[PDB]
Amino acid sequence: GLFGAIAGFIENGWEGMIDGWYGFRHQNSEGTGQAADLKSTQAAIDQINGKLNRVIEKTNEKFHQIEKEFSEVEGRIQDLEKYVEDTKIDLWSYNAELLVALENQHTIDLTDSEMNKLFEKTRRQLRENAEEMGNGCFKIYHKCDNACIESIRNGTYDHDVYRDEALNNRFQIKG
Amino acid sequence: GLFGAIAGFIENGWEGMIDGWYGFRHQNSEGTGQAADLKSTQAAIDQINGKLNRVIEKTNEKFHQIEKEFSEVEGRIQDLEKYVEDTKIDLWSYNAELLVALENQHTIDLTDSEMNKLFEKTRRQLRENAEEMGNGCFKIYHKCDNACIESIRNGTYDHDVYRDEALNNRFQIKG
Amino acid sequence: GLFGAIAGFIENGWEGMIDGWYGFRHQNSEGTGQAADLKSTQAAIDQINGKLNRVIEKTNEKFHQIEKEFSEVEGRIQDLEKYVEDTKIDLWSYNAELLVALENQHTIDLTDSEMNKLFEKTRRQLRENAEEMGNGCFKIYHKCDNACIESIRNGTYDHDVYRDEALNNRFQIKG
Amino acid sequence: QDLPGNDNSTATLCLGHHAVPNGTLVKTITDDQIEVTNATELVQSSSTGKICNNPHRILDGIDCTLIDALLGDPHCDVFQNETWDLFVERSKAFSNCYPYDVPDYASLRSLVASSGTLEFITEGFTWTGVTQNGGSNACKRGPGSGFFSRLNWLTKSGSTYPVLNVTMPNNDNFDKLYIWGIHHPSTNQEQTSLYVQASGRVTVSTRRSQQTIIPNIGSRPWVRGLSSRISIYWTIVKPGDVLVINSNGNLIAPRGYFKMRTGKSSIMRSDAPIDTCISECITPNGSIPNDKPFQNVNKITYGACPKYVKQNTLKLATGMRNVPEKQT
Amino acid sequence: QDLPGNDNSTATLCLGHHAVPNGTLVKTITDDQIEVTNATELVQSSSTGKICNNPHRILDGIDCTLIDALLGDPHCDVFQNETWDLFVERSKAFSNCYPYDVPDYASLRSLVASSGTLEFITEGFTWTGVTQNGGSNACKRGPGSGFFSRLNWLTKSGSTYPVLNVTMPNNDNFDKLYIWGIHHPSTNQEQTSLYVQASGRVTVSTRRSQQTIIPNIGSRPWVRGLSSRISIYWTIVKPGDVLVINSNGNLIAPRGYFKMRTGKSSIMRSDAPIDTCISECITPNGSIPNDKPFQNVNKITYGACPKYVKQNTLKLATGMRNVPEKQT
Amino acid sequence: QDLPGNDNSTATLCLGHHAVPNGTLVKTITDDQIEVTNATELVQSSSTGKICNNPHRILDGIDCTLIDALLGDPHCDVFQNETWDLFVERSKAFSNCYPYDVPDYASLRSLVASSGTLEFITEGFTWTGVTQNGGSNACKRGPGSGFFSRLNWLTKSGSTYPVLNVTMPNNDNFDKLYIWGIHHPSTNQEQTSLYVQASGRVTVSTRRSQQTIIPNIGSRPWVRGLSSRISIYWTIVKPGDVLVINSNGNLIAPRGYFKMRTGKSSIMRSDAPIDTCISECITPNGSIPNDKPFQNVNKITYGACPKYVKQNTLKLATGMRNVPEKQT
């Protein structure tokens, strides 16, 4: 949508991920692993539910109204009774049709947003120690065991601890 | 608009570009050149047309309705016939005026988005070999002939092929 | 909101800042200081005022209308007079409630946008001489006195002037 | 730091989002079928088919319409002094007493319908000089001839129908609804046989208003053996006002007043079954749940109901775009 | 990998977007003139000035209004049994037969207008004891005096106007519309010359209803030589019901029934030319194209038309912001 | 290049945004209380309690309703030929002349209300054979018996009430509104004492229409000593048309015409004080400022007013989210 992460730079979703809406897959010293991110999953869910509750906020109640069905033909007054109701129905139908259209558009952009925000958040954390491979995967340039991967995920990763190892691996090489 | 590329970090448009909506201009070892990007141009056009068709989706038809013009003065019932229509017209006029306002705001943000997405996409591709001069132009730090510029444009640019040349040019220098 | 700067990567606002809406706080070898950015402050204010004026654009005037209060019980025609007005009020109340809801959502995203755009603008300017600490603060890697901080703020900072000092401080170190 | 930290390996971390094999298409500002992870339906489009008898007071009219219940057609005597939040009128209802017509039937039905009560008070009208309690074989009450329970057909006594001039003060603190009528004879002979004068006249008035109706002699279609008709009229008398009924023939006199109230009561024509279940929204197709914001069951509703909409389905996306990883 | 790249140069790649010299201003949530690359108009604001005669059946009323066509004013005899999707009534239409008034003209015009047919069936009413086919010099049919083709003016026979009491059963499976009337004489002398009784009375009824009208003697303004008037009334008889016409003077009798239908027909007052072209939307200003969503031509419309709006222009941006490079 | 000389150091630059200690909660698409830096109220919810007498012409009816002012009840003689943008009717208004009723009071009040003028022109009607200027003790004009200033009660002269047949041509280029009426006697003896004929009749007509009303004898409730009533009727005569009044008894004759206009005038029932201040929007609760887009003061309004809404508060955020340093 607006941010270009979902159905954008992240090529596709993972049907495999069943424990949350956004998350990580790694490949490190002990192998490969997946894990849902629960903060962005909750952020997306809370917003969509907020949106959802506002739309289910109170049906107004109506009691005695006008007649809306007639068996004889009466002319002027009955023509107006029918017209008031038909122009009421068309106005409410328009409102329903535009309401879900705006809402839907916003939900796709909102979730695109959260994906991209998680990406940015992980980028910022990794600092000079990783490079964006451009498909939503960071190449981390230093030995990163499973506890290292877990510190990136739970947000305690200290970049300094690996900055020299990473900068050597990343730049120095032979050019 | 929301992303700050159009009429933002990209100082202005190019009246010169007549073959698409977004695109590249470059200067390299072999001379200078311009070229529209057709994927982002199509993305922006398809969205705007989708938007456009939904707005032209079926005029509802109406046959016998109420009278809306009168030559004599009748009082109570005619006062209501006139009031039902006038409050109908004001409600539909409001809807038209808010509909184009929302739509228009969204179109300027949507196209701002696509520009910025193309920028991001090119950034990601160039990897460690270029630097953002901050005006929507990347300074590429290695010899890049016309076929090199073409591979960035058509998305096949292999950054590795030039990473050492680029990293030398970019960092080493004298500090 | 959509960009994740306000109430996002920037942990909170500064009640201390009273001279504008967005701005800078710095710590260098001469001291510390704060200063509002007036371009982004004006951008945010102008948009919100534009939005505001369109909503206060002309009350339409109405003169003779229908009766909306009755003391005797009349049946069919009075039931319709009451129904036309009640369905009018509900339609206008719906419009007001959706209008402020859309508007408000947009205002929080629009201001989130401006914050993030100021951040991006400063990032682009600093080039290879600073690193994003991930909380909206750049670590500048070179001696930056108060006139240096002022040139970043007023947009005249020449990165080249400090590129070698910065690149040495930033990379070389011991890895 | 350490000493020569030499283990030059790398790691890869990829961010992503879920996808479901199934997915649901929803409409958007820019596309009208875009597939999302999940959506929810906002249009309620199906009734239970039964009118739940709770929380509102539903009064099933069975084979009486509300006006026959009001007038007191013999077969509707069940309904006297009854009350309701919603009177349900059935397609099968039938009238079976003296042929009558009501000039603004539509307003009288409305008026009573939303008052919500048929509570009748009898008042001591004194008709001097005429015969009371007239009835007819078309309005059989049991074995005998009868008439509407709430109306009183006056005819001549001996050889005279005097000019009736009665009054009934509204001394209470509420409005009083009076239902009265006039009898249109089939023949001039009938007019004189019953009311002596060859032209009746009924004038009912208060301080604020007056109605004078004059009968209309002539044959109408045989309805339950009769070509005559009576037409029904109504007068509301406000507190402190006074009713004066003045007639010189053909009057169908009131027996007292229905008391009017102000509430949430209304009437609904429906042949749906009433059932014991609790439901706030009633539609002539049966009750429907007001959990969704819009409904497509019926434009006629009573109670806390969703807004009727022309559309039968409107799905609100509740999840991200679905970009599957195959689709299995 | 590769060998010494002796020269080590740089390149510049810049991204950008188009701009047009011209551009169009559009309204926004935050600005009300922002210039964009391109926009499209959503308000249709101009008619062709001609009513296209396709796809709907347009019936040009020429100098007849629909009620005169219905009653059968001589000069409107062209329209008998005609049909339409849209009857167009012209400002120039004129009546030119016996002076009449129609108590609820507005509903009778509506009623007929949306039925969409003037198909008349003649039925065998038998008036015994009166003279039929009365006409007048104000309703000239050819050289002679005449009257509305669909009505039948009865007067006395010799020295008597008996009490007419006729019946006509609706045995078909459709509704039958009957148009009848009453003649109001100018003088009491006129009343007796034509109908003998000094006070007429017309009662038309079915099982469901009745109307009794009594004439009103007195001079009105001279209209085509006459101070008298006839007033028009209508009765619909449903399948299985029965019409009973009972009168004792002043009746203008029906000659049969117009048959009613249910369709998309309506009436429109317009002096726009009809032309041969196909257009779904008709406005009294002429047909307009329903390609745009909203229109500002006229609030009166028939067919698939854009929603009328107060605004005369609403531009939907279809392109990005226009940020050109030159000066102004 | 630039030569550092000696210092080796770093700086920190942080970007941020303001926050306020206080803050205001606003509704959103996704949350319904989110706190923002600042908001503004869009619902005007309070009146000044006084109707400003500027810029519209407010006419305070004091203790006259507009129909009594029109008819010319003695105590309303203040209002003759008066004009208004808004006639304010007070709860205290009372009638104090001959008991009258107006069949479509509601339309006559509307009709006059929006014409905005009570300018009366007297025309030379010549009633030959009847007594003019009748009045009553229930409509005291000063010490004497009187009647409505704009109506003329005719009674017999000597022993005859002839058949009145008068005409008044509309020769001017504007519509003329005529207010006339009929007197309903309490007794047949009264009918003959005043109008000789035992049954009156009033027929008022133009080329386009006619009304015939026949009186209705009978007792109504004593109102200012009387059981009789007069009912008010109105006829508009268009340019080039002609009024013909024809009666044979019980006519309350017009004395000329009110002239009608077309404007922005209307009527409002309110007991709010009029005051000297300028305000475009009037509500029966007093004037309200139309600076905000919506109002919750009253659904009845006159002038440039905000749209009435059910909500009493709707705040539009005018600032960013409030994320304070300590708490809120």
Ligand SMILES: CC(=O)N[C@H]1[C@H]([C@H](O)[C@H](O)CO)O[C@@](O[C@H]2[C@@H](O)[C@@H](CO)O[C@@H](O[C@H]3[C@H](O)[C@@H](O)[C@H](O)O[C@@H]3CO)[C@@H]2O)(C(=O)O)C[C@@H]1O
């Ligand atoms: C949806 C619909 O059917 N609307 C009808 C209504 C309903 O039938 C009615 O409201 C049910 O309560 O009837 C309307 O017509 C009535 C009207 O013609 C009056 C006379 O003016 O008569 C009613 O029928 C009577 C009949 O005349 C009596 O002899 C009999 O004793 O009772 C009958 C009713 O049960 C007509 O129904 C209406 O005005 O309300 C026409 C609507 O189109």
Ligand SMILES: CC(=O)N[C@H]1[C@H]([C@H](O)[C@H](O)CO)O[C@@](O[C@H]2[C@@H](O)[C@@H](CO)O[C@@H](O[C@H]3[C@H](O)[C@@H](O)[C@H](O)O[C@@H]3CO)[C@@H]2O)(C(=O)O)C[C@@H]1O
């Ligand atoms: C927009 C508009 O002009 N509305 C008028 C209509 C139209 O003129 C009419 O619908 C065209 O079909 O007329 C309304 O008034 C009619 C009403 O006064 C009746 C009598 O109650 O008479 C009509 O004129 C007759 C005239 O009386 C006959 O003598 C003559 O033979 O034919 C004339 C019609 O052609 C009035 O037009 C209406 O109620 O429909 C008033 C609307 O304001």
Ligand SMILES: CC(=O)N[C@H]1[C@H]([C@H](O)[C@H](O)CO)O[C@@](O[C@H]2[C@@H](O)[C@@H](CO)O[C@@H](O[C@H]3[C@H](O)[C@@H](O)[C@H](O)O[C@@H]3CO)[C@@H]2O)(C(=O)O)C[C@@H]1O
């Ligand atoms: C909100 C409201 O009160 N609506 C009433 C109105 C208003 O009272 C009226 O518009 C004020 O101008 O009155 C309505 O009823 C009137 C109606 O019954 C007619 C007769 O058909 O009489 C009016 O009262 C008269 C009374 O009959 C006269 O004897 C007396 O000289 O003057 C009185 C008026 O001042 C009733 O008010 C109406 O139809 O307009 C009923 C609304 O519910």
Ligand SMILES: CC(=O)N[C@H]1[C@H]([C@H](O)[C@H](O)CO)O[C@@](O[C@H]2[C@@H](O)[C@@H](CO)O[C@@H](O[C@H]3[C@H](O)[C@@H](O)[C@H](O)O[C@@H]3CO)[C@@H]2O)(C(=O)O)C[C@@H]1O
């Ligand atoms: C208070 C009272 O008078 N009750 C009478 C009624 C009324 O006289 C009658 O409703 C006035 O409209 O009449 C009752 O007898 C009538 C009944 O037998 C019917 C059945 O058809 O016929 C009436 O006489 C008819 C006669 O049968 C027809 O053939 C003829 O063409 O016309 C006559 C018109 O009067 C009877 O009067 C009744 O039960 O309705 C007896 C009540 O006690």
Ligand SMILES: CC(=O)N[C@H]1[C@H]([C@H](O)[C@H](O)CO)O[C@@](O[C@H]2[C@@H](O)[C@@H](CO)O[C@@H](O[C@H]3[C@H](O)[C@@H](O)[C@H](O)O[C@@H]3CO)[C@@H]2O)(C(=O)O)C[C@@H]1O
């Ligand atoms: C069935 C029938 O009676 N046809 C007559 C009609 C009717 O008698 C008449 O329409 C009833 O309203 O009258 C016809 O003659 C009338 C015609 O000559 C007009 C022309 O003005 O005058 C009528 O008499 C007038 C008289 O001319 C006036 O000066 C006088 O003041 O009043 C008289 C009122 O009766 C003629 O009756 C006709 O053509 O309309 C002849 C039809 O055959």
Ligand SMILES: CC(=O)N[C@H]1[C@H]([C@H](O)[C@H](O)CO)O[C@@](O[C@H]2[C@@H](O)[C@@H](CO)O[C@@H](O[C@H]3[C@H](O)[C@@H](O)[C@H](O)O[C@@H]3CO)[C@@H]2O)(C(=O)O)C[C@@H]1O
């Ligand atoms: C033009 C004219 O006739 N003015 C008379 C009126 C009218 O005669 C009267 O309004 C017709 O409705 O009558 C005036 O006197 C009446 C007045 O004294 C009232 C007071 O109650 O009484 C009327 O007679 C009553 C009588 O008082 C009752 O007890 C009895 O039951 O009925 C009688 C019915 O006529 C007086 O006629 C008047 O002031 O209104 C005198 C006017 O000059």
Ligand SMILES: *[C@@H]1O[C@H](CO)[C@@H](O[C@@H]2O[C@H](CO)[C@@H](O[C@@H]3O[C@H](CO)[C@@H](O)[C@H](O)[C@@H]3O)[C@H](O)[C@H]2NC(C)=O)[C@H](O)[C@H]1NC(C)=O
């Ligand atoms: C005026 O004309 C009408 C219509 O012609 C006459 O109505 C008809 O009157 C007869 C005799 O009363 C009715 O007959 C009875 O009908 C029932 C049902 O069919 C049947 O059981 C009886 O044995 C008898 O046939 C007839 O139904 C009735 N028809 C209609 C449509 O109402 C009326 O009598 C005439 N009146 C006068 C005074 O001339």
Ligand SMILES: *[C@@H]1O[C@H](CO)[C@@H](O[C@@H]2O[C@H](CO)[C@@H](O[C@@H]3O[C@H](CO)[C@@H](O)[C@H](O)[C@@H]3O)[C@H](O)[C@H]2NC(C)=O)[C@H](O)[C@H]1NC(C)=O
């Ligand atoms: C009742 O009063 C009305 C109005 O005064 C009388 O109407 C007028 O009657 C005369 C004679 O019939 C009409 O004369 C006609 O004038 C036309 C030209 O406009 C002429 O061509 C005819 O030959 C005829 O002479 C006059 O037009 C008519 N005016 C109006 C406004 O209707 C009516 O005659 C009186 N009736 C009685 C019984 O007193």
Ligand SMILES: *[C@@H]1O[C@H](CO)[C@@H](O[C@@H]2O[C@H](CO)[C@@H](O[C@@H]3O[C@H](CO)[C@@H](O)[C@H](O)[C@@H]3O)[C@H](O)[C@H]2NC(C)=O)[C@H](O)[C@H]1NC(C)=O
């Ligand atoms: C028809 O019946 C009505 C109601 O019974 C009669 O009305 C009443 O008539 C009397 C005598 O005219 C009225 O009395 C007067 O009342 C005033 C006020 O108290 C008083 O000042 C007089 O001295 C006298 O007592 C009474 O108010 C009136 N009541 C009503 C409700 O209108 C009417 O008179 C009867 N008419 C005939 C011809 O029988």
Ligand SMILES: *[C@@H]1O[C@H](CO)[C@@H](O)[C@H](O)[C@H]1NC(C)=O
């Ligand atoms: C983050 O992960 C590391 C490795 O599992 C662990 O030591 C640390 O405590 C974790 N912190 C949190 C907040 O989970």
Ligand SMILES: *[C@@H]1O[C@H](CO)[C@@H](O)[C@H](O)[C@H]1NC(C)=O
């Ligand atoms: C991209 O450009 C290079 C140079 O023109 C060419 O060899 C390559 O095949 C192009 N790829 C595509 C998909 O156009």
Ligand SMILES: *[C@@H]1O[C@H](CO)[C@@H](O)[C@H](O)[C@H]1NC(C)=O
């Ligand atoms: C920016 O700041 C520097 C240091 O104060 C100053 O020399 C320069 O002129 C400033 N430029 C502007 C446009 O304020």
Ligand SMILES: *[C@@H]1O[C@H](CO)[C@@H](O)[C@H](O)[C@H]1NC(C)=O
């Ligand atoms: C789809 O959305 C609705 C509303 O949020 C929710 O009740 C439902 O459980 C969702 N489906 C799944 C599989 O989460």
Ligand SMILES: *[C@@H]1O[C@H](CO)[C@@H](O)[C@H](O)[C@H]1NC(C)=O
């Ligand atoms: C509800 O009832 C109406 C009329 O009885 C019928 O046409 C409609 O289709 C029904 N809809 C549903 C959902 O039952």
Ligand SMILES: *[C@@H]1O[C@H](CO)[C@@H](O)[C@H](O)[C@H]1NC(C)=O
């Ligand atoms: C402007 O937009 C409309 C609708 O998308 C399109 O038909 C028209 O061709 C556009 N103009 C140009 C120059 O592309």
Ligand SMILES: *[C@@H]1O[C@H](CO)[C@@H](O)[C@H](O)[C@H]1NC(C)=O
């Ligand atoms: C009108 O149509 C009917 C029905 O077919 C027909 O019998 C009648 O004679 C037609 N009359 C004319 C004048 O066309």
